[PDB]
Design an enzyme around this catalytic site. Sequence first.
Site, PDB file in Angstrom:
ATOM      1  N   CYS A   1       0.824  -1.200   0.000  1.00 43.34           N
ATOM      2  CA  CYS A   1       0.000   0.000   0.000  1.00 43.34           C
ATOM      3  C   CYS A   1       0.865   1.260   0.000  1.00 43.34           C
ATOM      4  O   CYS A   1       1.707   1.441   0.876  1.00 43.34           O
ATOM      5  CB  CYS A   1      -0.911  -0.007   1.229  1.00 43.34           C
TER       6      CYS A   1
ATOM      7  N   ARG B   1      -0.137   4.486   3.052  1.00 38.23           N
ATOM      8  CA  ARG B   1      -0.113   4.236   4.488  1.00 38.23           C
ATOM      9  C   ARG B   1       0.157   5.466   5.373  1.00 38.23           C
ATOM     10  O   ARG B   1       0.175   5.357   6.598  1.00 38.23           O
ATOM     11  CB  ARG B   1       0.906   3.139   4.805  1.00 38.23           C
TER      12      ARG B   1
ATOM     13  N   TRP C   1      -9.286   5.631  -0.791  1.00 41.66           N
ATOM     14  CA  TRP C   1      -9.564   6.355  -2.033  1.00 41.66           C
ATOM     15  C   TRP C   1      -8.507   6.052  -3.067  1.00 41.66           C
ATOM     16  O   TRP C   1      -7.376   5.694  -2.737  1.00 41.66           O
ATOM     17  CB  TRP C   1      -9.655   7.870  -1.805  1.00 41.66           C
TER      18      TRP C   1
ATOM     19  N   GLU D   1      -4.363   3.783 -10.830  1.00 42.83           N
ATOM     20  CA  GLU D   1      -5.037   2.514 -10.620  1.00 42.83           C
ATOM     21  C   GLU D   1      -6.101   2.293 -11.682  1.00 42.83           C
ATOM     22  O   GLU D   1      -6.240   1.193 -12.215  1.00 42.83           O
ATOM     23  CB  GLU D   1      -5.681   2.460  -9.235  1.00 42.83           C
TER      24      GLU D   1
HETATM   25  C1  HEM Z   1      -6.610   6.226   1.883  1.00 43.86           C
HETATM   26  C2  HEM Z   1      -6.115   6.004   0.630  1.00 43.86           C
HETATM   27  C3  HEM Z   1      -5.381   4.890   0.167  1.00 43.86           C
HETATM   28  C4  HEM Z   1      -4.645   4.921  -0.965  1.00 43.86           C
HETATM   29  C5  HEM Z   1      -4.576   6.106  -1.929  1.00 43.86           C
HETATM   30  C6  HEM Z   1      -4.046   3.625  -1.144  1.00 43.86           C
HETATM   31  C7  HEM Z   1      -3.387   3.237  -2.314  1.00 43.86           C
HETATM   32  C8  HEM Z   1      -3.029   1.914  -2.644  1.00 43.86           C
HETATM   33  C9  HEM Z   1      -2.556   1.467  -3.945  1.00 43.86           C
HETATM   34  C10 HEM Z   1      -2.196   2.289  -5.195  1.00 43.86           C
HETATM   35  C11 HEM Z   1      -2.476   0.126  -3.923  1.00 43.86           C
HETATM   36  C12 HEM Z   1      -2.180  -0.785  -5.137  1.00 43.86           C
HETATM   37  C13 HEM Z   1      -3.513  -1.286  -5.673  1.00 43.86           C
HETATM   38  C14 HEM Z   1      -3.374  -2.352  -6.749  1.00 43.86           C
HETATM   39  O1  HEM Z   1      -2.357  -2.355  -7.476  1.00 43.86           O
HETATM   40  O2  HEM Z   1      -4.301  -3.176  -6.881  1.00 43.86           O
HETATM   41  C15 HEM Z   1      -2.848  -0.250  -2.592  1.00 43.86           C
HETATM   42  C16 HEM Z   1      -2.836  -1.549  -2.149  1.00 43.86           C
HETATM   43  C17 HEM Z   1      -3.210  -1.947  -0.859  1.00 43.86           C
HETATM   44  N1  HEM Z   1      -3.650  -1.117   0.157  1.00 43.86           N
HETATM   45 FE1  HEM Z   1      -3.839   0.863   0.132  1.00 43.86          FE
HETATM   46  N2  HEM Z   1      -4.405   2.761  -0.114  1.00 43.86           N
HETATM   47  C18 HEM Z   1      -5.247   3.528   0.690  1.00 43.86           C
HETATM   48  C19 HEM Z   1      -6.018   2.975   1.739  1.00 43.86           C
HETATM   49  C20 HEM Z   1      -5.955   1.644   2.186  1.00 43.86           C
HETATM   50  C21 HEM Z   1      -6.695   1.149   3.314  1.00 43.86           C
HETATM   51  C22 HEM Z   1      -7.877   1.856   3.972  1.00 43.86           C
HETATM   52  C23 HEM Z   1      -6.169  -0.085   3.627  1.00 43.86           C
HETATM   53  C24 HEM Z   1      -6.444  -0.892   4.745  1.00 43.86           C
HETATM   54  C25 HEM Z   1      -7.049  -0.482   5.894  1.00 43.86           C
HETATM   55  C26 HEM Z   1      -5.205  -0.379   2.582  1.00 43.86           C
HETATM   56  C27 HEM Z   1      -4.627  -1.639   2.376  1.00 43.86           C
HETATM   57  C28 HEM Z   1      -3.937  -2.004   1.210  1.00 43.86           C
HETATM   58  C29 HEM Z   1      -3.627  -3.369   0.835  1.00 43.86           C
HETATM   59  C30 HEM Z   1      -3.880  -4.660   1.611  1.00 43.86           C
HETATM   60  C31 HEM Z   1      -3.153  -3.306  -0.420  1.00 43.86           C
HETATM   61  C32 HEM Z   1      -2.642  -4.436  -1.273  1.00 43.86           C
HETATM   62  C33 HEM Z   1      -3.822  -5.235  -1.782  1.00 43.86           C
HETATM   63  C34 HEM Z   1      -3.399  -6.298  -2.762  1.00 43.86           C
HETATM   64  O3  HEM Z   1      -2.428  -7.023  -2.463  1.00 43.86           O
HETATM   65  O4  HEM Z   1      -4.034  -6.407  -3.826  1.00 43.86           O
HETATM   66  N3  HEM Z   1      -5.060   0.693   1.701  1.00 43.86           N
HETATM   67  N4  HEM Z   1      -3.202   0.844  -1.791  1.00 43.86           N
HETATM   68  N1  NRG Z   2      -6.672   2.393  -3.349  1.00 42.33           N
HETATM   69  C1  NRG Z   2      -7.036   1.134  -3.095  1.00 42.33           C
HETATM   70  N2  NRG Z   2      -6.900   0.193  -4.033  1.00 42.33           N
HETATM   71  C2  NRG Z   2      -7.320  -1.206  -3.852  1.00 42.33           C
HETATM   72  C3  NRG Z   2      -7.306  -2.003  -5.145  1.00 42.33           C
HETATM   73  C4  NRG Z   2      -8.100  -1.284  -6.220  1.00 42.33           C
HETATM   74  C5  NRG Z   2      -7.687  -1.671  -7.632  1.00 42.33           C
HETATM   75  N3  NRG Z   2      -6.238  -1.376  -7.829  1.00 42.33           N
HETATM   76  C6  NRG Z   2      -8.533  -0.887  -8.632  1.00 42.33           C
HETATM   77  O1  NRG Z   2      -9.778  -1.028  -8.595  1.00 42.33           O
HETATM   78  O2  NRG Z   2      -7.945  -0.138  -9.438  1.00 42.33           O
HETATM   79  N4  NRG Z   2      -7.535   0.809  -1.899  1.00 42.33           N
HETATM   80  N5  NRG Z   2      -8.038   1.740  -0.910  1.00 42.33           N
HETATM   81  O3  NRG Z   2      -7.856   2.939  -1.030  1.00 42.33           O
HETATM   82  O4  NRG Z   2      -8.645   1.318   0.046  1.00 42.33           O
END
Ligand code: HEM
Ligand code: NRG
Lengths: 407, 410
Positions: A106, A109, A278, A283
């Site tokens: 992520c 974070r 968000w 993405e």
């Molecule tokens: C608040 C804004 C947030 C942004 C902008 C953000 C952004 C991202 C991005 C760009 C990815 C890659 C997505 C992909 O390639 O499919 C990601 C993955 C991830 N994020 Fe965040 N994130 C946010 C919030 C969260 C939240 C709320 C959680 C957990 C409480 C979280 C948990 C994770 C996890 C587990 C992944 C990896 C999921 C996977 O392996 O497919 N993220 N995030």
């Molecule tokens: N930003 C986040 N992404 C979670 C995976 C979404 C996927 N890449 C897609 O639909 O493009 N998660 N989040 O913010 O909780």
Amino acid sequence: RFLKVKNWETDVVLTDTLHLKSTLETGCTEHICMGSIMLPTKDQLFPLAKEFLDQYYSSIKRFGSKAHMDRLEEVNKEIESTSTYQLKDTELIYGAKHAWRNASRCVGRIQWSKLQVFDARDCTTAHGMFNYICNHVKYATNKGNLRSAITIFPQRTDGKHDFRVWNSQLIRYAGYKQPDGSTLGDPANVQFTEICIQQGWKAPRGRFDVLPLLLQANGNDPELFQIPPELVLEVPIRHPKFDWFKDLGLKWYGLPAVSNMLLEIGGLEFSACPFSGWYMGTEIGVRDYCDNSRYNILEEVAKKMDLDMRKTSSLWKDQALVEINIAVLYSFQSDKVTIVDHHSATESFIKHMENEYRCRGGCPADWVWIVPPMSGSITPVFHQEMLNYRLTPSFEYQPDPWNTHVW
Amino acid sequence: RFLKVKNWETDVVLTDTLHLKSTLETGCTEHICMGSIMLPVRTKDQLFPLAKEFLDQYYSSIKRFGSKAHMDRLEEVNKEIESTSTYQLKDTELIYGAKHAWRNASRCVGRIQWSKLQVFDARDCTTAHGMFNYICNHVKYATNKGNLRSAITIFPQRTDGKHDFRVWNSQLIRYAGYKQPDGSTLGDPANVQFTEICIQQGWKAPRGRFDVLPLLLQANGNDPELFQIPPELVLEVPIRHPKFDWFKDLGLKWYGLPAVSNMLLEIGGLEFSACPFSGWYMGTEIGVRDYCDNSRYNILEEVAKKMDLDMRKTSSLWKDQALVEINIAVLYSFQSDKVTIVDHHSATESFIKHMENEYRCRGGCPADWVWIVPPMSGSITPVFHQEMLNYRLTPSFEYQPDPWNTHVWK
Ligand code: HEM
Ligand SMILES: N=C(NCCC[C@H](N)C(=O)O)N[N+](=O)[O-]
Ligand code: HEM
Ligand SMILES: C[C@H](O)[C@H](O)[C@H]1CNc2nc(N)[nH]c(=O)c2N1
Ligand SMILES: C[C@H](O)[C@H](O)[C@H]1CNc2nc(N)[nH]c(=O)c2N1
Ligand SMILES: N=C(NCCC[C@H](N)C(=O)O)N[N+](=O)[O-]
Ligand SMILES: [Zn+2]
């Protein structure tokens, strides 16, 4: 052993010790690095539980306190008796926020601590689940001003009464294979869109059809539910200079909400824990829209841009890719739906990383995933060495529900 | 054992067995992965097994494993080692070793060309002037008037670590970098340190923005010496844009021949500290990194400004926009001046076919994803969707301390 991380753009060097508390195994060895591979009991429960509690109490400056010791004792007796235990509210909130904090993939974070936790552990049915989910979608969407959140259903017991959200995300477009042999909608969801059809969902057969929820409670069979349309915020995609872009007929949802992962806290496993925050522009713009296996819209957009697609060296794909992402961001911002671009997101992560290094002595990070799928080297994270390792609490992958459920 | 690799864009899965022959470490443990980390005198005894391994492979490849030719060579080598502490490689083995070092370079995306490599044996060289003559010939041959041919020049192998041959430059051809008291940098920031050493050693820098650096050569362990490359041998390309007529006014240009010269080549235990090699550029190396890295020429703002892009907010993606045009220009120029070059799309597609072919004929192909995927348009190139296995196979090209930090001056 202390490990050092160098940012080659600023020469700044950080020292990592947090990895010393690494639990699980990466998947790599001294002989092979699998960095780019997408996915490499009472006696077991109490130790894990102890590690977590010591962790929690240490964070609340009560390490060793009587409360600490009491709780630790209480859990043991509870585990020894109920062969499991229940997390107190506080430990649940902490656990979930920390699962996020430890998410090496992520990039956002820096927002980890501002997570809204919805304790859904009292839920018993699919309708109950639908109710909790709707409230989650509504709270998180907040009319465009997105707020991160996670809803946690009952933890696993005997594995035969697992709560599961079969959807990979709370909101995704349907995918259908057509006569031609081509695919209408989102190819990534074809199989699920099928499972819903076979279950009874009257699929509309459209390019952007919002899928129904397939909710499974207490190991029972999944049930379908339609998210109140009034609850699904969507953004029509238009360009700030190409009035013809609107004719592409593209649109996406504003709430990313991964819902097929497993949350682990103190040894306990919550197999139904949808979470949302968000979108980072790329993405949708790069991956969802341009991946060859997703909406694959590069050719179309190229054509309408009237550019030489005869040779790859014209970089027409790259040219189009940029304009497409300009439009996604532009749209979300125009409709006032929260969204972050790869430049801001990555810079923010760098800062977070620096904070994490001096406050936690480290920050697990998966470079392959952190670096955006476009303009890689012009974002800070590209030049930043990262160390990847697993820490709990954590979010983990888990087998697709349909691949293991006993109807 | 078997390790599977999957391509998430085709669902194609490959099986790796080659990794079994992996000998050296990766920096990665079972608990921590350092895949994104830039850089995590042998005894006469440890040498023979290494020689043997190498030779067993050589003979196996020419299909003469276990032959008398094979057996006698091992006997000859072991003897030589014991009696002289080292051993000389036969020309055929040296060519085999060089090609395989390239073949094994996990950070190289142009390996489909590994078999077609011109090897120049410079092992009889004894002086810097001699190295200069050798390098001049390499540059002339490889450049070939713009039709680049891959090649490598191999100078004497290390002996006692006291008579090492070294090419102090990081690339045979590179632009100078000068730090101003102003705090700003003139030219290429990356070559400031090396530039200073050249000036200190006697070079008279034109102090311009694109000054081809002088060669600093070290032969047989002696102090390094200066030499200027014959200008008529340095092919360059002025950068202009197909549609932006103001681009040419950016005063940009670059050299056509990429030739890393500071790595160490290891063959059968033998160490070659001076082994410059060259092939041809992938557009993004110049267009993205050399021109747009913040710590390089850093031309984004200027290219952006002249394009009149909304630079008030990053979310306008002006940077991304400028970047494409700039890469558009690097490619266009080279093609116009008929100088070999490949774009990141073609280069990565070819590498995928190369990689697949390698799995079928070798049982694997070690690759560094962090380095293979291009610094722009990452996910619209097949390598992005490709899982890879990184591991070390010898012969190999390794990094080595900068000569100025270890050299015992005379
Ligand atoms: C608040 C804004 C947030 C942004 C902008 C953000 C952004 C991202 C991005 C760009 C990815 C890659 C997505 C992909 O390639 O499919 C990601 C993955 C991830 N994020 Fe965040 N994130 C946010 C919030 C969260 C939240 C709320 C959680 C957990 C409480 C979280 C948990 C994770 C996890 C587990 C992944 C990896 C999921 C996977 O392996 O497919 N993220 N995030
Ligand atoms: N930003 C986040 N992404 C979670 C995976 C979404 C996927 N890449 C897609 O639909 O493009 N998660 N989040 O913010 O909780
Ligand atoms: C035919 C043209 C070739 C192309 C287009 C090609 C392309 C590339 C590219 C894009 C890189 C990364 C460069 C960087 O980021 O600094 C690279 C790295 C590498 N290539 Fe190739 N290559 C070719 C020929 C060669 C040759 C002839 C050799 C050796 C005989 C070779 C050995 C390597 C090595 C060792 C690296 C990693 C160097 C480092 O760590 O800085 N390549 N190549
Ligand atoms: C094969 C390779 O691991 C795969 O394509 C990865 C690369 N980096 C990624 N990075 C992010 N954020 N998301 C992804 O889905 C991927 N896919
Ligand atoms: C920190 C990170 O390892 C570093 O920026 C790497 C990433 N990938 C790269 N890939 C190539 N080809 N060349 C480089 O210099 C780098 N730099
Ligand atoms: N393509 C090659 N590149 C070598 C490194 C060049 C460096 N990135 C730069 O100057 O941008 N090798 N080769 O072709 O032999
Ligand atoms: Zn690794």
